[PDB]
Design a binder for this molecule. Structure first.
Ligand SMILES: Nc1ncnc2c1ncn2[C@@H]1O[C@H](CSCC[C@H](N)C(=O)O)[C@@H](O)[C@H]1O
Ligand SMILES: [Ca+2]
Ligand SMILES: [Cl-]
Ligand SMILES: [Zn+2]
Length: 235
C-alpha cells in the first residue's frame, strides 16, 4: 500500500487515511493496530512517574521485518518507549543504549511499571528489555557485538541531533556487522542521493541495500510535516 519506489527521487511514503481505521489510527495500513493504545499507555505511565511516536514505531516494525528471533537495538533510547512498543509488537529481545543516567533510570522504571500492564492486557509474557547506561561508542567499539545474532539484528539510530563525527563513526562500524542486519537512520550513514555515490564509495553499495523513506505526517514529535529516513540492509 506504500507509494513510491524507495529511491532517492521516489522515496517510499504512506499518505494518512482520511478516516481512522477500526482502532482509531490514521497512519497504519492495517485496519487494526495498537498505536492509540500505546499513546495513552505511554502518556499515563510517564505521568505516573525529539522522539518517535507510536505510529512511527508501528510502521517501522513492518518496514524492518522485525521478528521474535531478532534483537532490537535502540541507540539513544531515551525514555525507552520504542523498546516497549517493539517488544510488545514483535516479541524480539530489545536493548536500549542511553548516555544520560537520568534517562536510563526513567526507562528502567517505566519498563517495570509497563510490562505488567502489557502482559495483563495481551495475556502474553513480554520479551526481555535491557537498558545500558553508556555512550554507544564505548559499547560498539567491541567488534564482537551483534556477531552471534547472525544478522537477526535490527538497529534504530535516531541521530538527527547527533554530532556528525558520531554518525561517521557509526557508519564505519556498521560496515562490519553481520549480513542481514537492518539499520534505520535519519542523518544518512551512507549518503547516496547522487548517482556518483556508488563510484565514491563502492564498498557501501557492495555491503548495503539502501532504501529511502518519508516518515508519515505527525509520526515524529518535532515535526507535524514529513521528512526523510533511510533503511540500510547488510547484504
Ligand atoms: N553518544 C550517545 N550514546 C548514547 N546515547 C546518546 C548518545 N548521544 C545522544 N544519545 C541519546 O539519544 C537520544 C536521542 S532522542 C531519541 C529517543 C528514541 N530513540 C526515540 O526514537 O524516540 C537522547 O536521549 C540522547 O540522550
Ligand atoms: Ca564483523
Ligand atoms: Cl562480518
Ligand atoms: Zn496505527
Amino acid at each position: 500500500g506504500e507509494l513510491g519506489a524507495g529511491t532517492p527521487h521516489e522515496p517510499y511514503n504512506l499518505p494518512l487515511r482520511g478516516n481512522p481505521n477500526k482502532s482509531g489510527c490514521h497512519h497504519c495500513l492495517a485496519d487494526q493496530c495498537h498505536c492509540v493504545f500505546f499513546e495513552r499507555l505511554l502518556d499515563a505511565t510517564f505521568r505516573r512517574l525529539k522522539s518517535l511516536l507510536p505510529t512511527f514505531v508501528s510502521r517501522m516494525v513492518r518496514l524492518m521485518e522485525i521478528t521474535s528471533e531478532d534483537t532490537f537495538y535502540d541507540l539513544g533510547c531515551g525514555n525507552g518507549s520504542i523498546l516497549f512498543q517493539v517488544a510488545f509488537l514483535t516479541g524480539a529481545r530489545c536493548v536500549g543504549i542511553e548516555i544520560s543516567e537520568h534517562n536510563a533510570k526513567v526507562a528502567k522504571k517505566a519498563w517495570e511499571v509497563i510490562r505488567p500492564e502489557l502482559e495483563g492486557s495481551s495475556g502474553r509474557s513480554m520479551s526481555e528489555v535491557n537498558i545500558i547506561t553508556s555512550d554507544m561508542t564505548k559499547i560498539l567499539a567491541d567488534e564482537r557485538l551483534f556477531e552471534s545474532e547472525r544478522g537477526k539484528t535490527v538497529i534504530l539510530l535516531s541521530n538527527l541531533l547527533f554530532p556528525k563525527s558520531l554518525t561517521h563513526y557509526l557508519s564505519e562500524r556498521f560496515r562490519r556487522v553481520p549480513s542481514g542486519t537492518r539499520i534505520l537512520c535519519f542523518d544518512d550513514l551512507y549518503p547516496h542521493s547522487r548517482s556518483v555515490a556508488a563510484i565514491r564509495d563502492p564498498e557501501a553499495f557492495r555491503l548495503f541495500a539502501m532504501t529511502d523513506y518519508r516518515w508519515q505526517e505527525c509520526s515524529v514529535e518535532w515535526c507535524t510535516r514529513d521528512g526523510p529516513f533511510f533503511i540500510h540492509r547488510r547484504r
